[PDB]
Amino acid sequence: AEGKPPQREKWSSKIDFVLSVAGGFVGLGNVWRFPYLCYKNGGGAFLIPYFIFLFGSGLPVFFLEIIIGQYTSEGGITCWEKICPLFSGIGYASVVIVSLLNVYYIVILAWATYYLFQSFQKELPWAHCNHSWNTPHCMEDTMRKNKSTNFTSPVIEFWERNVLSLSPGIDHPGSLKWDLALCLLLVWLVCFFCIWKGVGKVVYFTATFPFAMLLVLLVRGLTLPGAGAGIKFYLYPDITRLEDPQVWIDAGTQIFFSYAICLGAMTSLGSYNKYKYNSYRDCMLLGCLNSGTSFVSGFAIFSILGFMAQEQGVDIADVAESGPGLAFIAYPKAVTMMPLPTFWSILFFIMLLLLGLDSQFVEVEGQITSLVDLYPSFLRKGYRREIFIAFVCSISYLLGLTMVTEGGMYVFQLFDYYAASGVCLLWVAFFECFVIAWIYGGDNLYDGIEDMIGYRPGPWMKYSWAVITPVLCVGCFIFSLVKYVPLTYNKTYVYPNWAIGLGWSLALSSMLCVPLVIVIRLCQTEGPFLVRVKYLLTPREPN
Numbered sequence: 001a002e003g004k005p006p007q008r009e010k011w012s013s014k015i016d017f018v019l020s021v022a023g024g025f026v027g028l029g030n031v032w033r034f035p036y037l038c039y040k041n042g043g044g045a046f047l048i049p050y051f052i053f054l055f056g057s058g059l060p061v062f063f064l065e066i067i068i069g070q071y072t073s074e075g076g077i078t079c080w081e082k083i084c085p086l087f088s089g090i091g092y093a094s095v096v097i098v099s100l101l102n103v104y105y106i107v108i109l110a111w112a113t114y115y116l117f118q119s120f121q122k123e124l125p126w127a128h129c130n131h132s133w134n135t136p137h138c139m140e141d142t143m144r145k146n147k148s149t150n151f152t153s154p155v156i157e158f159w160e161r162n163v164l165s166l167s168p169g170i171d172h173p174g175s176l177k178w179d180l181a182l183c184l185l186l187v188w189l190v191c192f193f194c195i196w197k198g199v200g201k202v203v204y205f206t207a208t209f210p211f212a213m214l215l216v217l218l219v220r221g222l223t224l225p226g227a228g229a230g231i232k233f234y235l236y237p238d239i240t241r242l243e244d245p246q247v248w249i250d251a252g253t254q255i256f257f258s259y260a261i262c263l264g265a266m267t268s269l270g271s272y273n274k275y276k277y278n279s280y281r282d283c284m285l286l287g288c289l290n291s292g293t294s295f296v297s298g299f300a301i302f303s304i305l306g307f308m309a310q311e312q313g314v315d316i317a318d319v320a321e322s323g324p325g326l327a328f329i330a331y332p333k334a335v336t337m338m339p340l341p342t343f344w345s346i347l348f349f350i351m352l353l354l355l356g357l358d359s360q361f362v363e364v365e366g367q368i369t370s371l372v373d374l375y376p377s378f379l380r381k382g383y384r385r386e387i388f389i390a391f392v393c394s395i396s397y398l399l400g401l402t403m404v405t406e407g408g409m410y411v412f413q414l415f416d417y418y419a420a421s422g423v424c425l426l427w428v429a430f431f432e433c434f435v436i437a438w439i440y441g442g443d444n445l446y447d448g449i450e451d452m453i454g455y456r457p458g459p460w461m462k463y464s465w466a467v468i469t470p471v472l473c474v475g476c477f478i479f480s481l482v483k484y485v486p487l488t489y490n491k492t493y494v495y496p497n498w499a500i501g502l503g504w505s506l507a508l509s510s511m512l513c514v515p516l517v518i519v520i521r522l523c524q525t526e527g528p529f530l531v532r533v534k535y536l537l538t539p540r541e542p543n
């Protein structure tokens with residue numbers, strides 16, 4: 001009838017938790033989004049707000065999500081019923097955010113698959129510019145300085161004329177690309193078959209190959225000439241850029257995105273932990289590993305960029321796209337200089353695919369588990385769950401088909417900025433921290449943490465939950481709103497008004513779930529307003 005006793009099968013060993021978390025929040029957000037966002041925001045001044053957010057609101061919120069999941073023993077959509085039923089809309093907002101993120105998180109893997117397929121031939125296409133797709137301006141980067149128009153390198157010509165085939169603006173959708181659609185279908189089929197059945201010895205190889213490949217890339221990048229200028233550009237900050245809301249709104253949002261918080265996945269992962277498991281040290285070490293990985297990789301990219309700038313003769317700020325395609329212009333160029341380029345290119349794209357696939361598996365499984373926990377009778381047992389998973393995957397693929405046309409890069413950039421990024425994360429993080437600090441009780445949460453982990457933590461977590469996170473969120477929100485700046489692609493193309501309206505609607509769709517739930521709960525209860533709000537603030541609504 002109720003079938004509750006099965007509950008949630010706890011992890012077999014803490015190793016399963018460590019590996020699942022590491023594969024969850026260490027993915028493409030460390031090796032693809034961090035370098036290009038750092039490059040876009042001047043470079044060097046991006047680190048101060050980055051570390052300020054990381055040490056004030058990045059790790060405490062992740063630990064709060066994990067500890068809430070371990071405490072309530074419930075997913076990311078039902079745990080708020082046992083904490084604050086009035087503010088139960090946070091779970092729905094997180095579900096919407098992760099659903100919108102999973103749609104566009106796969107196009108990067110589709111591009112990686114296309115590159116890997118194209119790299120299986122004798123000579124790499126992005127090494128010479130005598131191919132058909134090349135324009136009359138392409139000039140080998142070796143001869144660029146010797147000669148002197150606006151010549152374009154073969155690597156960029158390839159990226160913007162074979163994989164992308166860009167169109168003049170979002171007004172023109174061109175025609176659907178079929179090879180990219182096939183790659184998208186292949187990736188989605190692999191993901192569905194992995195989630196459907198299955199999650200010993202290959203798990204020790206999946207979690208070690210990317211780090212070795214990254215170390216090899218770092219060694220090659222540091223060995224290259226001209227790396228000193230790139231490192232200096234990467235590290236030395238520009239204090240005159242901090243007076244712009246873009247730097248802060250990018251650094252804080254990137255910190256929130258890279259830790260996979262405000263998504264309902266960390267809570268679901270922590271829900272499987274034991275009630276007497278010391279998760280504090282493990283969470284701190286995993287956060288340290290994530291931050292260390294994202295920072296070291298940047299040295300490899302910025303040294304390659306400095307070498308490219310020195311070789312071509314142009315400045316370090318005009319050597320690549322400065323957009324969502326920096327990782328497809330920097331690393332493929334460095335692969336060419338290595339001996340036996342094809343082998344290294346294959347290995348690099350394989351590790352990129354693995355890094356993306358692990359995170360995609362984790363997030364999709366978390367979302368499906370939350371939606372199943374919502375309804376544990378109809379969407380459960382046998383054939384009624386696989387059909388639901390297939391329906392979700394098919395709908396996601398059909399929606400993501402919009403980003404593989406001749407003008408899908410603009411839609412991808414709009415999705416990246418507005419959906420699952422920007423102010424929709426700040427809103428949810430602020431509401432979570434404010435509720436936990438000022439309604440349930442930081443002291444009560446600390447008592448529970450001391451009961452379950454064994455020793456009472458320090459005041460850093462309480463202070464960050466109480467004063468440091470909401471202040472930063474509100475300040476960043478107001479600063480961004482007051483000094484409005486429109487979004488542009490490659491700092492040259494300006495979007496139409498309706499595109500900005502669509503992006504703001506995408507953000508508001510996730511943002512507008514808390515007041516709706518508040519109103520519905522208020523009108524679903526009988527009695528005076530004050531009596532209703534007081535009863536809907538009591539933590540133990542069920543049991």
Ligand SMILES: CC(C)CCC[C@@H](C)[C@H]1CC[C@H]2[C@@H]3CC=C4C[C@@H](O)CC[C@]4(C)[C@H]3CC[C@]12C
Nearest residue numbers: 173174175176395396397398399400401402405
């Ligand atoms: C909600 C789920 C089903 C997806 C929503 C349907 C939309 C977004 C999907 C379904 C069919 C897809 C279309 C199929 C064919 C074309 C032709 C091309 O000239 C423009 C892209 C376009 C138009 C695709 C874009 C995305 C598309 C319109």
Ligand SMILES: CC(C)CCC[C@@H](C)[C@H]1CC[C@H]2[C@@H]3CC=C4C[C@@H](O)CC[C@]4(C)[C@H]3CC[C@]12C
Nearest residue numbers: 088092093096509510512513516517520521524
């Ligand atoms: C009594 C409570 C549990 C009922 C919950 C249902 C209401 C509160 C929730 C459930 C999920 C929420 C929806 C999540 C997704 C969407 C799609 C978006 O395009 C419009 C908002 C909308 C429609 C949200 C509105 C409010 C919503 C429907």
Ligand SMILES: CCCCCCCCCCCCCCCC
Nearest residue numbers: 052055056458459460463464468
């Ligand atoms: C704006 C500051 C960002 C970095 C600092 C975050 C919080 C630091 C800890 C707060 C508590 C101070 C005492 C901690 C050591 C005893």
Ligand SMILES: CCCCCCCCCCCCCCCC
Nearest residue numbers: 092095096097099100371374509
């Ligand atoms: C981007 C819009 C759709 C994204 C997914 C939304 C589904 C989750 C919220 C609604 C599911 C529960 C509805 C019934 C609740 C009693």
Ligand SMILES: CCCCCCCCCCCCCCCC
Nearest residue numbers: 099100103371375392395396399
């Ligand atoms: C815009 C992104 C959409 C991604 C796919 C939709 C995900 C959620 C749809 C199914 C919700 C089912 C709720 C429970 C129904 C019994």
Ligand SMILES: CCCCCCCCCCCCCCCC
Nearest residue numbers: 170171172173399402411502506
């Ligand atoms: C008006 C000239 C033609 C424009 C063609 C539409 C381009 C793509 C717009 C749709 C992108 C978002 C899809 C829906 C997301 C919920």
Ligand SMILES: CCCCCCCCCCCCCCCC
Nearest residue numbers: 280281284285287288291292295
């Ligand atoms: C790039 C460095 C990021 C480091 C983030 C974590 C620093 C906090 C110290 C963690 C040390 C190990 C755990 C000790 C017990 C709390």
Ligand SMILES: CCCCCCCCCCCCCCCC
Nearest residue numbers: 018282285286288289292293296
């Ligand atoms: C089982 C304990 C937790 C597992 C993770 C431990 C990570 C320890 C810190 C390692 C930081 C290395 C950064 C290297 C970046 C390339």
Ligand SMILES: CCCCCCCCCCCCCCCC
Nearest residue numbers: 466467470471472474475478479
């Ligand atoms: C003792 C008070 C601690 C902070 C209480 C919550 C602060 C919520 C935001 C208030 C405004 C912060 C600065 C915004 C500047 C635009």
Ligand SMILES: CCCCCCCCCCCCCCCC
Nearest residue numbers: 514515516518519522523528529
């Ligand atoms: C922005 C988050 C907090 C918003 C709080 C107010 C939400 C709307 C409340 C209006 C209640 C109307 C129904 C009253 C029934 C007696």
Ligand SMILES: [Cl-]
Nearest residue numbers: 030034258294
């Ligand atoms: Cl990061």
